[PDB]
């Protein structure tokens, strides 16, 4: 039953699943949902596909939202559909069916940032005793205080399309971090980051340590001509760009050159492209004759040294601060420069026009004396209307402080609007986002790739006949009655 | 303090140069006892302790930026003593950036459009620390360091009875 | 009863006191804690030392934490161990 209102188009709609059982989930009744399967004349099925090749369970998550009362009733229906499902179709695994794009519902629950089922969906208490074949996503053995255990459906990085495949790259994120702060995905941060943070430091070394000695060329550089060490520099200046060119290019080969939707913090990823791209300007002048090489390779060295700020990351906490401010002030920096710099055009014209009694861009430095500010203020009376330019410049002492103030207080508003543990968790997102490249290896060509031997403990504890899973053991301390 | 003493008769010579720091840090460390004659100290060690972590994080970020730009200054201005030429960049640290534009370098716009990049990020480099501090006070402390005043006193009681 | 899990090493543990009465504090029951002293065949004792030479009361504080509900029940056991203790061993000072 598909149409205008039943299509997922923006506004005047809701994509409930375009068939009788699909809206029966949205009806929050749980009485006809049983009967429309139990009906002996023509029984329905969760197997019923739609315009995007979905069972009802994909529509449950799309119809689910940030309304606790709705998610609570949605959860209650959702859990019992597996009890009615697995009973009537035990041969069919229910939460592994893919849409038309090739995406499972538990994975697709991460795609739209569903809040309040999604935490529930991972953390489920109903297999033992009444569906022992369903497997919880939870288990426990040996507790005085509980030694817990969580399973792995698709959420571990390497399994070909996890949530780590989309929450890192294809995240349509109203805000992510919380979805990640839940215990099985949250704890997973450190289980491999122990093994990866040393290799991150080992690769971070290789990012920054060669950028250090990349500078000493310019220290020893002559303008016009064991001294082979100076000439040797050129061979590492080749590698300065060419290493970080290919490396950041084949990232887009696996990111397929994905569209600007990931503008959020992938500008940091393309800040490496700036150094990579801009290093070549000198190389292919430099033997030939062309001449603009020393003038513009300045910026190649500049932005490279600038972009070493990026890794203010995980050796200490502070970064919880770093990207919180650095991200939000990139919006402030845009709003700052758009307001300020455009004021002083007509006043540099007013300065040169009143001081009459293409090189005015250099005469605008007279006004840029007061930007720091170190306003000259030097009053003379050769202009013959002395009070014009003198009573002009006193107008800017107040508004220049205001132009700092309003941004100082637009910032106050950003911190007055409290963030409890939002960007504190984005520290772990920035780390877990940086985990994307760790398991894959290096088409940089140290070793052309790296394999996968980073999977978690074999469950081998389920109900007959399929007894097998992949799982992980977690520790807890609880103080209830027992 | 001893560095001067056991040069000073003998002949060795580096005594007046390095006893400066003995006098300096001694006068500096008289800040320590901003303690109990008035309350204020409830403020003193609250900030002084937490900003010692901020001071470490501040210097690690800032000072290392201006190495390659002092090289960029001397390299573009061609047309071991560069540590003294780095004072040209440390003019803008306070800041009292010279800004003096000349055209003998023959690519005038390189070093001129370079230096304008640092007016924004130097304010940002203050800002992010100003607001990393805001975050430390946004994360409210009710009577925590107000009581650490009494800890600092009761910690200083350790030596009083012993003699 | 000492081992890997019963040792105080970081993670995969809790140092409860490595003997029957020591975990009987952690069980939050206060019914067997009396009987394992009142038992006429072989009575236990708070005098029972462990790998760090402790009574049960040193383990109570190590097992105690920043959980109000746990400290509340821990306090209730802790106070009554002195009432059962001082009654049955009045000669011995217990918290020294």
Numbering used by the authors:
A (entry chain D): 194 to 418, 430 to 561, 591 to 715
B (entry chain A): 483 to 561, 591 to 674
C (entry chain A): 194 to 289
Authors' text:
Here we report the structure of full-length rat TRPV2 at ∼5 Å resolution determined by cryo-EM single particle reconstruction. Based on the cryo-EM map, we are able to build models for all transmembrane (TM) helices (S1–S6), the pore helix, the selectivity filter, the N-terminal linker and a portion of the C terminus of the channel using the previously published TRPV1 atomic models as homology models. All six N-terminal ankyrin repeats of the ankyrin repeat domain (ARD) are clearly resolved, suggesting that the ARD is a rigid, stable domain in full-length TRPV2. Despite the expression of full-length TRPV2, density accounting for the first 73 residues of the N terminus (Met 1–Asp 73), the S1–S2 linker (Ile 422–Gly 430), the pore turret (Glu 561–Leu 594) and the last 46 residues of the C terminus (Glu 716–Pro 761) are not apparent in the cryo-EM map (grey), suggesting that these regions are flexible or disordered. Like TRPV1 and TRPA1, the pore of apo-TRPV2 consists of two constrictions or gates: an upper gate resides at the selectivity filter in the outer pore region of the channel and a lower gate is comprised of the distal end of S6. A more detailed structural analysis of the apo-TRPV2 pore domain unexpectedly revealed that the upper and lower constrictions are wider than the homologous sites of TRPV1 (Gly 643 and Ile 679) in the absence of ligand (apo-TRPV1) with distances of 12.4 Å and 16.1 Å when measured Cα–Cα at the upper and lower constrictions, respectively. The upper gate of apo-TRPV2 is wider than the closed upper gate of TRPV1 (apo- and capsaicin–TRPV1), as well as the open upper gate of TRPV1 (RTX/DkTx–TRPV1). In addition, the lower gate of apo-TRPV2 has a larger Cα–Cα distance compared with TRPV1 in all states, including the open lower gate in RTX/DkTx–TRPV1 (14.4 Å). These results suggest that the TRPV2 channel can accommodate partially hydrated Ca2+, Na+ and K+ ions, as well as large organic cations in the apo state. Our analysis reveals that in the absence of ligand, full-length rat TRPV2 contains wider upper and lower gates compared with the ‘minimal' rat TRPV1 and truncated rabbit TRPV2.
